[PDB]
PDB file of all heavy atoms in Angstrom:
ATOM      1  N   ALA A  83     -42.804  11.985 -80.989  1.00 52.33           N
ATOM      2  CA  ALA A  83     -43.748  11.775 -82.079  1.00 52.33           C
ATOM      3  C   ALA A  83     -44.974  11.010 -81.585  1.00 52.33           C
ATOM      4  O   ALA A  83     -46.101  11.234 -82.036  1.00 52.33           O
ATOM      5  CB  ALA A  83     -43.063  10.993 -83.215  1.00 52.33           C
ATOM      6  N   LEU A  84     -44.747  10.107 -80.642  1.00 53.38           N
ATOM      7  CA  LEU A  84     -45.827   9.291 -80.093  1.00 53.38           C
ATOM      8  C   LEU A  84     -46.674  10.152 -79.165  1.00 53.38           C
ATOM      9  O   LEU A  84     -47.911  10.065 -79.153  1.00 53.38           O
ATOM     10  CB  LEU A  84     -45.233   8.122 -79.307  1.00 53.38           C
ATOM     11  CG  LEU A  84     -45.973   6.798 -79.346  1.00 53.38           C
ATOM     12  CD1 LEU A  84     -45.837   6.215 -80.753  1.00 53.38           C
ATOM     13  CD2 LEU A  84     -45.389   5.847 -78.295  1.00 53.38           C
ATOM     14  N   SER A  85     -45.994  10.969 -78.372  1.00 56.45           N
ATOM     15  CA  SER A  85     -46.679  11.855 -77.444  1.00 56.45           C
ATOM     16  C   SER A  85     -47.607  12.742 -78.268  1.00 56.45           C
ATOM     17  O   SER A  85     -47.175  13.393 -79.228  1.00 56.45           O
ATOM     18  CB  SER A  85     -45.659  12.698 -76.670  1.00 56.45           C
ATOM     19  OG  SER A  85     -44.859  11.877 -75.818  1.00 56.45           O
ATOM     20  N   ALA A  86     -48.882  12.754 -77.892  1.00 59.58           N
ATOM     21  CA  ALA A  86     -49.895  13.523 -78.602  1.00 59.58           C
ATOM     22  C   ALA A  86     -49.989  13.016 -80.047  1.00 59.58           C
ATOM     23  O   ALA A  86     -48.981  12.666 -80.663  1.00 59.58           O
ATOM     24  CB  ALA A  86     -49.556  15.009 -78.581  1.00 59.58           C
ATOM     25  N   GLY A  87     -51.211  12.977 -80.569  1.00 63.53           N
ATOM     26  CA  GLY A  87     -51.439  12.500 -81.920  1.00 63.53           C
ATOM     27  C   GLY A  87     -52.304  11.256 -81.884  1.00 63.53           C
ATOM     28  O   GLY A  87     -53.247  11.122 -82.662  1.00 63.53           O
ATOM     29  N   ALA A  88     -51.978  10.351 -80.966  1.00 58.78           N
ATOM     30  CA  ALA A  88     -52.710   9.101 -80.795  1.00 58.78           C
ATOM     31  C   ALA A  88     -52.914   8.809 -79.311  1.00 58.78           C
ATOM     32  O   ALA A  88     -53.577   7.839 -78.941  1.00 58.78           O
ATOM     33  CB  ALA A  88     -51.948   7.959 -81.444  1.00 58.78           C
ATOM     34  N   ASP A  89     -52.335   9.657 -78.467  1.00 59.01           N
ATOM     35  CA  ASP A  89     -52.444   9.500 -77.026  1.00 59.01           C
ATOM     36  C   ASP A  89     -51.914   8.166 -76.529  1.00 59.01           C
ATOM     37  O   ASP A  89     -50.722   8.029 -76.261  1.00 59.01           O
ATOM     38  CB  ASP A  89     -53.897   9.660 -76.577  1.00 59.01           C
ATOM     39  CG  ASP A  89     -54.455  11.024 -76.898  1.00 59.01           C
ATOM     40  OD1 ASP A  89     -54.511  11.373 -78.096  1.00 59.01           O
ATOM     41  OD2 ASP A  89     -54.835  11.750 -75.956  1.00 59.01           O
ATOM     42  N   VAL A  90     -52.790   7.172 -76.430  1.00 55.54           N
ATOM     43  CA  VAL A  90     -52.383   5.873 -75.900  1.00 55.54           C
ATOM     44  C   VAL A  90     -52.734   4.587 -76.645  1.00 55.54           C
ATOM     45  O   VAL A  90     -52.816   4.531 -77.874  1.00 55.54           O
ATOM     46  CB  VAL A  90     -52.925   5.701 -74.472  1.00 55.54           C
ATOM     47  CG1 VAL A  90     -52.259   6.697 -73.535  1.00 55.54           C
ATOM     48  CG2 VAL A  90     -54.436   5.899 -74.480  1.00 55.54           C
ATOM     49  N   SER A  91     -52.921   3.560 -75.820  1.00 56.95           N
ATOM     50  CA  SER A  91     -53.257   2.187 -76.172  1.00 56.95           C
ATOM     51  C   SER A  91     -52.008   1.331 -76.195  1.00 56.95           C
ATOM     52  O   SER A  91     -51.050   1.615 -76.917  1.00 56.95           O
ATOM     53  CB  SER A  91     -53.976   2.095 -77.514  1.00 56.95           C
ATOM     54  OG  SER A  91     -54.485   0.786 -77.696  1.00 56.95           O
ATOM     55  N   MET A  92     -52.021   0.292 -75.371  1.00 55.45           N
ATOM     56  CA  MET A  92     -50.909  -0.641 -75.285  1.00 55.45           C
ATOM     57  C   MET A  92     -51.214  -1.836 -76.185  1.00 55.45           C
ATOM     58  O   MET A  92     -50.372  -2.251 -76.975  1.00 55.45           O
ATOM     59  CB  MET A  92     -50.715  -1.092 -73.830  1.00 55.45           C
ATOM     60  CG  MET A  92     -49.746  -2.244 -73.630  1.00 55.45           C
ATOM     61  SD  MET A  92     -49.674  -2.739 -71.882  1.00 55.45           S
ATOM     62  CE  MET A  92     -47.928  -2.379 -71.462  1.00 55.45           C
ATOM     63  N   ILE A  93     -52.436  -2.352 -76.078  1.00 53.84           N
ATOM     64  CA  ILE A  93     -52.869  -3.513 -76.858  1.00 53.84           C
ATOM     65  C   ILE A  93     -54.003  -3.139 -77.809  1.00 53.84           C
ATOM     66  O   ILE A  93     -54.492  -2.005 -77.788  1.00 53.84           O
ATOM     67  CB  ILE A  93     -53.386  -4.634 -75.931  1.00 53.84           C
ATOM     68  CG1 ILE A  93     -52.447  -4.804 -74.732  1.00 53.84           C
ATOM     69  CG2 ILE A  93     -53.469  -5.942 -76.702  1.00 53.84           C
ATOM     70  CD1 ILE A  93     -53.050  -5.618 -73.612  1.00 53.84           C
ATOM     71  N   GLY A  94     -54.436  -4.098 -78.625  1.00 54.63           N
ATOM     72  CA  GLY A  94     -55.517  -3.831 -79.551  1.00 54.63           C
ATOM     73  C   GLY A  94     -55.058  -2.985 -80.721  1.00 54.63           C
ATOM     74  O   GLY A  94     -53.929  -2.502 -80.736  1.00 54.63           O
ATOM     75  N   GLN A  95     -55.927  -2.790 -81.709  1.00 54.92           N
ATOM     76  CA  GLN A  95     -55.531  -2.001 -82.868  1.00 54.92           C
ATOM     77  C   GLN A  95     -55.088  -0.628 -82.392  1.00 54.92           C
ATOM     78  O   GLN A  95     -55.631  -0.076 -81.442  1.00 54.92           O
ATOM     79  CB  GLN A  95     -56.668  -1.902 -83.881  1.00 54.92           C
ATOM     80  CG  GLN A  95     -56.195  -1.535 -85.284  1.00 54.92           C
ATOM     81  CD  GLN A  95     -55.420  -2.647 -85.975  1.00 54.92           C
ATOM     82  OE1 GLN A  95     -54.913  -2.466 -87.085  1.00 54.92           O
ATOM     83  NE2 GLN A  95     -55.328  -3.803 -85.326  1.00 54.92           N
ATOM     84  N   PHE A  96     -54.095  -0.087 -83.066  1.00 52.10           N
ATOM     85  CA  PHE A  96     -53.482   1.184 -82.700  1.00 52.10           C
ATOM     86  C   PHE A  96     -52.838   1.121 -81.312  1.00 52.10           C
ATOM     87  O   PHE A  96     -52.694   2.126 -80.619  1.00 52.10           O
ATOM     88  CB  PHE A  96     -54.427   2.412 -82.883  1.00 52.10           C
ATOM     89  CG  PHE A  96     -55.527   2.563 -81.851  1.00 52.10           C
ATOM     90  CD1 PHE A  96     -55.249   3.041 -80.570  1.00 52.10           C
ATOM     91  CD2 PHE A  96     -56.854   2.299 -82.194  1.00 52.10           C
ATOM     92  CE1 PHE A  96     -56.279   3.261 -79.642  1.00 52.10           C
ATOM     93  CE2 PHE A  96     -57.897   2.513 -81.280  1.00 52.10           C
ATOM     94  CZ  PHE A  96     -57.614   2.996 -79.997  1.00 52.10           C
ATOM     95  N   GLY A  97     -52.402  -0.076 -80.925  1.00 50.76           N
ATOM     96  CA  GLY A  97     -51.717  -0.209 -79.649  1.00 50.76           C
ATOM     97  C   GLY A  97     -50.223  -0.055 -79.924  1.00 50.76           C
ATOM     98  O   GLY A  97     -49.803  -0.353 -81.046  1.00 50.76           O
ATOM     99  N   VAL A  98     -49.420   0.434 -78.971  1.00 55.50           N
ATOM    100  CA  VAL A  98     -47.961   0.581 -79.208  1.00 55.50           C
ATOM    101  C   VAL A  98     -47.137  -0.220 -78.205  1.00 55.50           C
ATOM    102  O   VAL A  98     -45.929  -0.002 -78.029  1.00 55.50           O
ATOM    103  CB  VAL A  98     -47.459   2.046 -79.162  1.00 55.50           C
ATOM    104  CG1 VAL A  98     -48.123   2.853 -80.283  1.00 55.50           C
ATOM    105  CG2 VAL A  98     -47.728   2.679 -77.767  1.00 55.50           C
ATOM    106  N   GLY A  99     -47.820  -1.148 -77.544  1.00 55.88           N
ATOM    107  CA  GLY A  99     -47.175  -2.018 -76.589  1.00 55.88           C
ATOM    108  C   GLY A  99     -46.471  -1.307 -75.467  1.00 55.88           C
ATOM    109  O   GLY A  99     -46.995  -0.353 -74.898  1.00 55.88           O
ATOM    110  N   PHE A 100     -45.276  -1.788 -75.149  1.00 54.01           N
ATOM    111  CA  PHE A 100     -44.477  -1.251 -74.043  1.00 54.01           C
ATOM    112  C   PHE A 100     -44.255   0.271 -74.053  1.00 54.01           C
ATOM    113  O   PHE A 100     -44.125   0.876 -72.987  1.00 54.01           O
ATOM    114  CB  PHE A 100     -43.127  -1.955 -74.022  1.00 54.01           C
ATOM    115  CG  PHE A 100     -42.432  -1.910 -72.689  1.00 54.01           C
ATOM    116  CD1 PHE A 100     -42.472  -3.017 -71.834  1.00 54.01           C
ATOM    117  CD2 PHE A 100     -41.710  -0.786 -72.301  1.00 54.01           C
ATOM    118  CE1 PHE A 100     -41.790  -3.004 -70.612  1.00 54.01           C
ATOM    119  CE2 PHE A 100     -41.024  -0.757 -71.090  1.00 54.01           C
ATOM    120  CZ  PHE A 100     -41.065  -1.876 -70.239  1.00 54.01           C
ATOM    121  N   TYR A 101     -44.173   0.867 -75.244  1.00 53.17           N
ATOM    122  CA  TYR A 101     -43.975   2.316 -75.360  1.00 53.17           C
ATOM    123  C   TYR A 101     -45.021   3.151 -74.616  1.00 53.17           C
ATOM    124  O   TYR A 101     -44.715   4.216 -74.065  1.00 53.17           O
ATOM    125  CB  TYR A 101     -43.942   2.719 -76.831  1.00 53.17           C
ATOM    126  CG  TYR A 101     -42.762   2.126 -77.552  1.00 53.17           C
ATOM    127  CD1 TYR A 101     -42.949   1.170 -78.554  1.00 53.17           C
ATOM    128  CD2 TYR A 101     -41.454   2.436 -77.172  1.00 53.17           C
ATOM    129  CE1 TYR A 101     -41.876   0.534 -79.140  1.00 53.17           C
ATOM    130  CE2 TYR A 101     -40.373   1.798 -77.762  1.00 53.17           C
ATOM    131  CZ  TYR A 101     -40.592   0.847 -78.738  1.00 53.17           C
ATOM    132  OH  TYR A 101     -39.543   0.167 -79.331  1.00 53.17           O
ATOM    133  N   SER A 102     -46.262   2.687 -74.593  1.00 53.46           N
ATOM    134  CA  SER A 102     -47.314   3.432 -73.896  1.00 53.46           C
ATOM    135  C   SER A 102     -47.032   3.590 -72.406  1.00 53.46           C
ATOM    136  O   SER A 102     -47.570   4.491 -71.754  1.00 53.46           O
ATOM    137  CB  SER A 102     -48.671   2.749 -74.066  1.00 53.46           C
ATOM    138  OG  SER A 102     -48.639   1.445 -73.530  1.00 53.46           O
ATOM    139  N   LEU A 103     -46.199   2.721 -71.847  1.00 50.42           N
ATOM    140  CA  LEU A 103     -45.923   2.836 -70.415  1.00 50.42           C
ATOM    141  C   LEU A 103     -45.116   4.109 -70.192  1.00 50.42           C
ATOM    142  O   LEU A 103     -45.279   4.783 -69.181  1.00 50.42           O
ATOM    143  CB  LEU A 103     -45.115   1.638 -69.934  1.00 50.42           C
ATOM    144  CG  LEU A 103     -45.716   0.262 -70.160  1.00 50.42           C
ATOM    145  CD1 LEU A 103     -44.737  -0.768 -69.629  1.00 50.42           C
ATOM    146  CD2 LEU A 103     -47.074   0.157 -69.472  1.00 50.42           C
ATOM    147  N   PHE A 104     -44.241   4.429 -71.147  1.00 53.80           N
ATOM    148  CA  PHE A 104     -43.425   5.625 -71.013  1.00 53.80           C
ATOM    149  C   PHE A 104     -44.244   6.903 -71.156  1.00 53.80           C
ATOM    150  O   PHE A 104     -43.726   8.008 -70.940  1.00 53.80           O
ATOM    151  CB  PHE A 104     -42.279   5.621 -72.004  1.00 53.80           C
ATOM    152  CG  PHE A 104     -41.242   4.582 -71.699  1.00 53.80           C
ATOM    153  CD1 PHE A 104     -40.851   3.674 -72.662  1.00 53.80           C
ATOM    154  CD2 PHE A 104     -40.662   4.512 -70.440  1.00 53.80           C
ATOM    155  CE1 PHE A 104     -39.890   2.710 -72.391  1.00 53.80           C
ATOM    156  CE2 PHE A 104     -39.698   3.547 -70.149  1.00 53.80           C
ATOM    157  CZ  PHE A 104     -39.312   2.644 -71.128  1.00 53.80           C
ATOM    158  N   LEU A 105     -45.524   6.764 -71.487  1.00 51.84           N
ATOM    159  CA  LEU A 105     -46.387   7.944 -71.615  1.00 51.84           C
ATOM    160  C   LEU A 105     -47.062   8.270 -70.268  1.00 51.84           C
ATOM    161  O   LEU A 105     -47.579   9.372 -70.072  1.00 51.84           O
ATOM    162  CB  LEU A 105     -47.449   7.708 -72.703  1.00 51.84           C
ATOM    163  CG  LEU A 105     -46.948   7.501 -74.139  1.00 51.84           C
ATOM    164  CD1 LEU A 105     -48.104   7.102 -75.048  1.00 51.84           C
ATOM    165  CD2 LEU A 105     -46.286   8.763 -74.648  1.00 51.84           C
ATOM    166  N   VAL A 106     -47.043   7.305 -69.347  1.00 51.28           N
ATOM    167  CA  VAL A 106     -47.641   7.449 -68.015  1.00 51.28           C
ATOM    168  C   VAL A 106     -46.588   7.461 -66.900  1.00 51.28           C
ATOM    169  O   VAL A 106     -46.830   7.900 -65.764  1.00 51.28           O
ATOM    170  CB  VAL A 106     -48.606   6.271 -67.750  1.00 51.28           C
ATOM    171  CG1 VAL A 106     -48.925   6.154 -66.268  1.00 51.28           C
ATOM    172  CG2 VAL A 106     -49.885   6.471 -68.547  1.00 51.28           C
ATOM    173  N   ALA A 107     -45.406   6.988 -67.251  1.00 54.62           N
ATOM    174  CA  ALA A 107     -44.346   6.884 -66.284  1.00 54.62           C
ATOM    175  C   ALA A 107     -43.022   7.321 -66.890  1.00 54.62           C
ATOM    176  O   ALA A 107     -42.777   7.115 -68.082  1.00 54.62           O
ATOM    177  CB  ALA A 107     -44.256   5.434 -65.814  1.00 54.62           C
ATOM    178  N   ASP A 108     -42.164   7.925 -66.078  1.00 54.44           N
ATOM    179  CA  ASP A 108     -40.871   8.328 -66.589  1.00 54.44           C
ATOM    180  C   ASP A 108     -39.820   7.293 -66.282  1.00 54.44           C
ATOM    181  O   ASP A 108     -38.787   7.246 -66.926  1.00 54.44           O
ATOM    182  CB  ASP A 108     -40.449   9.670 -66.016  1.00 54.44           C
ATOM    183  CG  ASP A 108     -41.052  10.830 -66.780  1.00 54.44           C
ATOM    184  OD1 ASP A 108     -40.925  10.842 -68.024  1.00 54.44           O
ATOM    185  OD2 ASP A 108     -41.658  11.703 -66.134  1.00 54.44           O
ATOM    186  N   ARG A 109     -40.088   6.460 -65.292  1.00 52.12           N
ATOM    187  CA  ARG A 109     -39.162   5.416 -64.907  1.00 52.12           C
ATOM    188  C   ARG A 109     -39.981   4.133 -64.874  1.00 52.12           C
ATOM    189  O   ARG A 109     -41.106   4.133 -64.392  1.00 52.12           O
ATOM    190  CB  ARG A 109     -38.570   5.709 -63.521  1.00 52.12           C
ATOM    191  CG  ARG A 109     -37.612   4.662 -62.969  1.00 52.12           C
ATOM    192  CD  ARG A 109     -37.105   5.047 -61.550  1.00 52.12           C
ATOM    193  NE  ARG A 109     -36.205   4.042 -60.988  1.00 52.12           N
ATOM    194  CZ  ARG A 109     -35.944   3.877 -59.689  1.00 52.12           C
ATOM    195  NH1 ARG A 109     -36.507   4.646 -58.767  1.00 52.12           N
ATOM    196  NH2 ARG A 109     -35.123   2.910 -59.301  1.00 52.12           N
ATOM    197  N   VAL A 110     -39.408   3.051 -65.384  1.00 54.16           N
ATOM    198  CA  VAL A 110     -40.101   1.769 -65.419  1.00 54.16           C
ATOM    199  C   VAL A 110     -39.137   0.678 -65.037  1.00 54.16           C
ATOM    200  O   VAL A 110     -38.016   0.651 -65.521  1.00 54.16           O
ATOM    201  CB  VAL A 110     -40.634   1.473 -66.858  1.00 54.16           C
ATOM    202  CG1 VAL A 110     -41.303   0.100 -66.897  1.00 54.16           C
ATOM    203  CG2 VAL A 110     -41.612   2.570 -67.316  1.00 54.16           C
ATOM    204  N   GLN A 111     -39.556  -0.196 -64.132  1.00 56.30           N
ATOM    205  CA  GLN A 111     -38.750  -1.314 -63.754  1.00 56.30           C
ATOM    206  C   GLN A 111     -39.555  -2.576 -64.095  1.00 56.30           C
ATOM    207  O   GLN A 111     -40.774  -2.590 -64.017  1.00 56.30           O
ATOM    208  CB  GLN A 111     -38.436  -1.303 -62.263  1.00 56.30           C
ATOM    209  CG  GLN A 111     -37.182  -0.527 -61.911  1.00 56.30           C
ATOM    210  CD  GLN A 111     -36.907  -0.478 -60.405  1.00 56.30           C
ATOM    211  OE1 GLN A 111     -37.646  -1.046 -59.608  1.00 56.30           O
ATOM    212  NE2 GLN A 111     -35.828   0.189 -60.025  1.00 56.30           N
ATOM    213  N   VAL A 112     -38.855  -3.637 -64.469  1.00 54.13           N
ATOM    214  CA  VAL A 112     -39.521  -4.880 -64.789  1.00 54.13           C
ATOM    215  C   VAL A 112     -38.749  -5.902 -64.040  1.00 54.13           C
ATOM    216  O   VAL A 112     -37.584  -6.152 -64.356  1.00 54.13           O
ATOM    217  CB  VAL A 112     -39.455  -5.185 -66.281  1.00 54.13           C
ATOM    218  CG1 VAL A 112     -40.044  -6.571 -66.550  1.00 54.13           C
ATOM    219  CG2 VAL A 112     -40.223  -4.118 -67.062  1.00 54.13           C
ATOM    220  N   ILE A 113     -39.371  -6.460 -63.006  1.00 57.54           N
ATOM    221  CA  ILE A 113     -38.707  -7.494 -62.209  1.00 57.54           C
ATOM    222  C   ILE A 113     -39.151  -8.822 -62.819  1.00 57.54           C
ATOM    223  O   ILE A 113     -40.340  -9.038 -62.981  1.00 57.54           O
ATOM    224  CB  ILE A 113     -39.147  -7.357 -60.749  1.00 57.54           C
ATOM    225  CG1 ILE A 113     -38.789  -5.935 -60.266  1.00 57.54           C
ATOM    226  CG2 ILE A 113     -38.420  -8.350 -59.873  1.00 57.54           C
ATOM    227  CD1 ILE A 113     -39.372  -5.552 -58.882  1.00 57.54           C
ATOM    228  N   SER A 114     -38.235  -9.720 -63.173  1.00 58.03           N
ATOM    229  CA  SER A 114     -38.721 -10.922 -63.827  1.00 58.03           C
ATOM    230  C   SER A 114     -37.982 -12.183 -63.434  1.00 58.03           C
ATOM    231  O   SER A 114     -36.789 -12.153 -63.167  1.00 58.03           O
ATOM    232  CB  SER A 114     -38.659 -10.738 -65.357  1.00 58.03           C
ATOM    233  OG  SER A 114     -39.643 -11.540 -66.013  1.00 58.03           O
ATOM    234  N   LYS A 115     -38.729 -13.287 -63.388  1.00 60.68           N
ATOM    235  CA  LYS A 115     -38.188 -14.593 -63.019  1.00 60.68           C
ATOM    236  C   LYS A 115     -38.746 -15.636 -63.956  1.00 60.68           C
ATOM    237  O   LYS A 115     -39.947 -15.909 -63.950  1.00 60.68           O
ATOM    238  CB  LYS A 115     -38.574 -14.988 -61.572  1.00 60.68           C
ATOM    239  CG  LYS A 115     -38.135 -16.437 -61.171  1.00 60.68           C
ATOM    240  CD  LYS A 115     -36.630 -16.535 -61.005  1.00 60.68           C
ATOM    241  CE  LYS A 115     -36.156 -17.935 -60.617  1.00 60.68           C
ATOM    242  NZ  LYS A 115     -36.574 -18.954 -61.627  1.00 60.68           N
ATOM    243  N   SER A 116     -37.863 -16.212 -64.760  1.00 64.35           N
ATOM    244  CA  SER A 116     -38.238 -17.252 -65.688  1.00 64.35           C
ATOM    245  C   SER A 116     -37.710 -18.568 -65.106  1.00 64.35           C
ATOM    246  O   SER A 116     -36.686 -18.569 -64.423  1.00 64.35           O
ATOM    247  CB  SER A 116     -37.588 -16.974 -67.049  1.00 64.35           C
ATOM    248  OG  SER A 116     -37.539 -18.130 -67.883  1.00 64.35           O
ATOM    249  N   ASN A 117     -38.406 -19.674 -65.354  1.00 61.48           N
ATOM    250  CA  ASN A 117     -37.941 -20.978 -64.853  1.00 61.48           C
ATOM    251  C   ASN A 117     -36.502 -21.242 -65.316  1.00 61.48           C
ATOM    252  O   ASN A 117     -35.759 -21.983 -64.680  1.00 61.48           O
ATOM    253  CB  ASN A 117     -38.840 -22.115 -65.360  1.00 61.48           C
ATOM    254  CG  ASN A 117     -40.242 -22.079 -64.766  1.00 61.48           C
ATOM    255  OD1 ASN A 117     -40.477 -21.411 -63.767  1.00 61.48           O
ATOM    256  ND2 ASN A 117     -41.180 -22.813 -65.385  1.00 61.48           N
ATOM    257  N   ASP A 118     -36.094 -20.629 -66.418  1.00 62.33           N
ATOM    258  CA  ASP A 118     -34.742 -20.880 -66.915  1.00 62.33           C
ATOM    259  C   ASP A 118     -33.659 -19.921 -66.434  1.00 62.33           C
ATOM    260  O   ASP A 118     -32.532 -19.963 -66.924  1.00 62.33           O
ATOM    261  CB  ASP A 118     -34.726 -20.896 -68.443  1.00 62.33           C
ATOM    262  CG  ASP A 118     -35.685 -21.915 -69.021  1.00 62.33           C
ATOM    263  OD1 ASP A 118     -35.642 -23.084 -68.584  1.00 62.33           O
ATOM    264  OD2 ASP A 118     -36.470 -21.547 -69.916  1.00 62.33           O
ATOM    265  N   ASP A 119     -33.965 -19.036 -65.499  1.00 56.83           N
ATOM    266  CA  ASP A 119     -32.916 -18.119 -65.049  1.00 56.83           C
ATOM    267  C   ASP A 119     -33.221 -17.641 -63.643  1.00 56.83           C
ATOM    268  O   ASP A 119     -34.180 -18.098 -63.030  1.00 56.83           O
ATOM    269  CB  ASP A 119     -32.825 -16.929 -66.006  1.00 56.83           C
ATOM    270  CG  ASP A 119     -31.425 -16.338 -66.089  1.00 56.83           C
ATOM    271  OD1 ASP A 119     -30.576 -16.587 -65.201  1.00 56.83           O
ATOM    272  OD2 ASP A 119     -31.174 -15.602 -67.055  1.00 56.83           O
ATOM    273  N   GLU A 120     -32.391 -16.737 -63.139  1.00 54.30           N
ATOM    274  CA  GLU A 120     -32.549 -16.186 -61.801  1.00 54.30           C
ATOM    275  C   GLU A 120     -33.368 -14.897 -61.872  1.00 54.30           C
ATOM    276  O   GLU A 120     -33.723 -14.463 -62.966  1.00 54.30           O
ATOM    277  CB  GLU A 120     -31.177 -15.915 -61.188  1.00 54.30           C
ATOM    278  CG  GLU A 120     -30.479 -17.220 -60.762  1.00 54.30           C
ATOM    279  CD  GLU A 120     -31.404 -18.081 -59.911  1.00 54.30           C
ATOM    280  OE1 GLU A 120     -31.571 -17.767 -58.717  1.00 54.30           O
ATOM    281  OE2 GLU A 120     -31.982 -19.067 -60.437  1.00 54.30           O
ATOM    282  N   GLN A 121     -33.693 -14.310 -60.723  1.00 54.29           N
ATOM    283  CA  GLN A 121     -34.483 -13.072 -60.713  1.00 54.29           C
ATOM    284  C   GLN A 121     -33.649 -11.849 -61.084  1.00 54.29           C
ATOM    285  O   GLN A 121     -32.578 -11.605 -60.501  1.00 54.29           O
ATOM    286  CB  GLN A 121     -35.119 -12.845 -59.346  1.00 54.29           C
ATOM    287  CG  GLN A 121     -36.107 -11.643 -59.299  1.00 54.29           C
ATOM    288  CD  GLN A 121     -37.037 -11.715 -58.079  1.00 54.29           C
ATOM    289  OE1 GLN A 121     -37.300 -10.713 -57.398  1.00 54.29           O
ATOM    290  NE2 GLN A 121     -37.538 -12.900 -57.808  1.00 54.29           N
ATOM    291  N   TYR A 122     -34.155 -11.071 -62.046  1.00 50.59           N
ATOM    292  CA  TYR A 122     -33.450  -9.887 -62.496  1.00 50.59           C
ATOM    293  C   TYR A 122     -34.339  -8.668 -62.551  1.00 50.59           C
ATOM    294  O   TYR A 122     -35.567  -8.769 -62.561  1.00 50.59           O
ATOM    295  CB  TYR A 122     -32.844 -10.097 -63.889  1.00 50.59           C
ATOM    296  CG  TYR A 122     -31.543 -10.906 -63.914  1.00 50.59           C
ATOM    297  CD1 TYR A 122     -31.561 -12.278 -64.170  1.00 50.59           C
ATOM    298  CD2 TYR A 122     -30.314 -10.297 -63.679  1.00 50.59           C
ATOM    299  CE1 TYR A 122     -30.387 -13.035 -64.204  1.00 50.59           C
ATOM    300  CE2 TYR A 122     -29.122 -11.032 -63.703  1.00 50.59           C
ATOM    301  CZ  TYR A 122     -29.174 -12.409 -63.964  1.00 50.59           C
ATOM    302  OH  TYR A 122     -28.022 -13.148 -63.960  1.00 50.59           O
TER     303      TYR A 122
END
């Protein structure tokens, strides 16, 4: 439903946040390190 109709935008009005990444990539990895935990 997201694909085509509004195309993109992650931020700003009509932005869809993280979902827009799946419109440019089929696989997404998020490597993260918070002061309160280990690297995941």
Side-chain angles (χ1 to χ4, degrees):
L84 215 70
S85 294
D89 299 61
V90 294
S91 190
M92 170 183 243
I93 316 165
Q95 200 70 184
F96 74 76
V98 297
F100 202 100
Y101 295 113
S102 60
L103 303 179
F104 291 127
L105 297 173
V106 163
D108 277 309
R109 178 181 179 202
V110 177
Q111 271 178 1
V112 174
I113 302 171
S114 207
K115 175 71 180 58
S116 161
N117 292 344
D118 303 310
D119 210 342
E120 286 310 283
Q121 187 162 137
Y122 281 96

